[PDB]
Amino acid sequence: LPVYAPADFIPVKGKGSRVWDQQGKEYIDFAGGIAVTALGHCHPALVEALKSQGETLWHTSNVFTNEPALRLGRKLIDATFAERVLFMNSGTEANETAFKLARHYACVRHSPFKTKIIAFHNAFHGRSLFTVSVGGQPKYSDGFGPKPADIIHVPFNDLHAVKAVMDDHTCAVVVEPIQGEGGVQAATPEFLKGLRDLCDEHQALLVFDEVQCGMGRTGDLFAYMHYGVTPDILTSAKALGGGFPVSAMLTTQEIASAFSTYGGNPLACAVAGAAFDIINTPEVLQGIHTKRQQFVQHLQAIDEQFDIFSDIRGMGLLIGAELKPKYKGRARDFLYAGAEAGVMVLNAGADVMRFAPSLVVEEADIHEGMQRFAQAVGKVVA
């Protein structure tokens, strides 16, 4: 079921897209700690930001603001639909704030009875009681006592189902523009635009969970930019801090007033500022699309030799490769084989291989790592 590392696989050092364990074994990192290390390990710019702010100021409480948080909030506001930003520590906390806000906005603006949240099967939004209940995997939300109520789940990419359950008592639609954990499934243009129109019609807020697909992952700063569909609330984490625990919730002044920056650990925000400055450049964003195709070509060549993939999908450097029916439920086996061959990869359910490397992964590492993965595949299929 769950993917756990054995006692002889403990990473100790990371440099760029390469990782070494206790025994000195070298790995190519196509996993990024599950799309977290978007600029690789110990990136000189991020290390410098960490070290310099570390000599100056680490922590301020939420009653105080700080320069790093102000600078970062300004950068997020200037680059996105957002007019207000709220900083926390993790994607789960960002989602908690987003869901609470959508609930409270509806409560004060319209009615205390306007509480329905529409979410999707296979959705992942975190592991707190509230976020995991909004998540679309019953197995992970079962067994913790009474779940917070008024959450309705329908299939991802099923617009009609959404239309069918939504009403004047609906406060929010929560969606990942691309379901990362859920098989790397991208929203269709019709579906995502349909969600915007339905939210408009019912006076509900459209909440985009961009914890995984945000901060450069898709080759745009945020996935919503690719679609041209503007949410009411957006959450960001993982890539935001490039390894440092930080998250952000983005919304408009009108919605935020129901509760330009709030919170944000000075050290976290300085690091996230440095990461933002690198990721939000035309050149890096262009490179993400160049690098994606380098990966895809290798995956196509692997399928040509071994006949193992039915679909190659995702956006930018969030890559999903679905296994053929003859290899249904073998994703974990391919992952472990990869680790043996010195390449770190991911799953997205039992049938899907997932890749989420550094957005600046070198071409040399792409070729070497994918050659290692091709070797690993050969060991599994023989």
124 as an active site residue: the answer is: yes
**DSSP symbol at 238:** G
Binds 176: which of a copy of itself, ligand PLP, none (CB < 5-8 Å by kind):
ligand PLP
With binding defined as CB under 6 A, does residue 372 bind ligand PLP?
no
Q: Between vectors from CA 223 to CA 73 and to CA 286, what angle results, nearest 5°?
A: 90
Q: Is 261 annotated as a binding residue?
A: yes
212 lies in the site for ligand PLP, by CB under 6 A: yes
Establish whether 311 is a catalytic residue. Answer: no
x/- letters, 105..124, toward ligand PLP (CB under 6 A): -------------------x
Residue 256: CB minimum distance to a copy of itself, A: 15
Are the C-beta atoms of 225 and 22 separated by less than 8 Å? no
Contacting residue, 29, 96, 176, 365, with ligand PLP by CB under 6 A: 176
How far apart (Å, rounded) are the C-alpha atoms in residues 382 and 380? 6
The interface mask with ligand PLP, positions 268-287, x = CB under 6 A, is --------------------
Rounded-to-integer distance, Cα 357 and Cα 57, Å = 31
Determine which residue in the list 66, 90, 115, 236 makes contact with ligand PLP, applying CB under 6 A. 90
Pairing between β-strand 346-347 and β-strand 352-355 as defined by DSSP bridges: antiparallel
128 binds, among a copy of itself, ligand PLP, none (CB under 5 to 8 A by kind): a copy of itself
Q: Smallest distance from the beta carbon of 217 to ligand PLP, in angstroms?
A: 10
41's contact among a copy of itself, ligand PLP, none, with CB below 5 to 8 A by partner kind, is a copy of itself
Bridge partners (DSSP) listed for residue 59 = none
Minimum CB separation of residue 8 from a copy of itself in Å reads: 10
* Residue from 29, 120, 209, 355 carrying the catalytic annotation: 209
Q: Establish whether 211 is an annotated binding residue.
A: yes
How many Å apart are CA 222 and CA 236, to the nearest integer? 9
Q: Which of 87, 99, 124, 156 is catalytic?
A: 124
Identify the CA nearest to 98 among candidates 194, 235, 4, 202.
235
Radius of gyration of the chain from Cα atoms?
A: 21
Task: Give the nearest distance from C-beta 221 to a copy of itself in angstroms.
Answer: 21
The neighbour count for residue 48, using CB atoms within 10 Å, is 13
Beta strands 205-209 and 170-175: pairing type?
Answer: parallel
Residue from 16, 126, 182, 349 that binds ligand PLP (CB under 6 A)? Answer: 126
Please say if 193 is a catalytic residue.
Answer: no
Nearest approach, Cβ of residue 153 and a copy of itself (Å): 16
| Smallest separation (angstroms) from a copy of itself to the CB of 319 | 17
Question: What residue spans of the chain are helical by DSSP H?
Answer: 32-35, 44-54, 67-79, 91-109, 129-134, 138-141, 159-165, 189-202, 223-227, 253-256, 266-279, 282-306, 331-340, 363-381
By CB under 6 A, name the one of 17, 53, 92, 133 that touches ligand PLP. 92
SS3 98: helix
Spatial neighbors of 126 by CB under 8 A, at least 6 apart, are 90, 91, 92, 93, 95, 96, 132, 135
Which one of ligand PLP, a copy of itself, none interacts with residue 60, CB within 5 to 8 A by kind? Answer: a copy of itself
Is residue 342 marked as binding? no
Interface contacts to ligand PLP, rule CB under 6 A: 90-92, 95, 124-126, 176, 180-181, 209, 211-212, 237
Binding-site residue set for pyridoxal 5'-phosphate: 91-92, 124, 209-212, 261
**What amino acid positions are annotated as catalytic residues?**
124, 209, 238
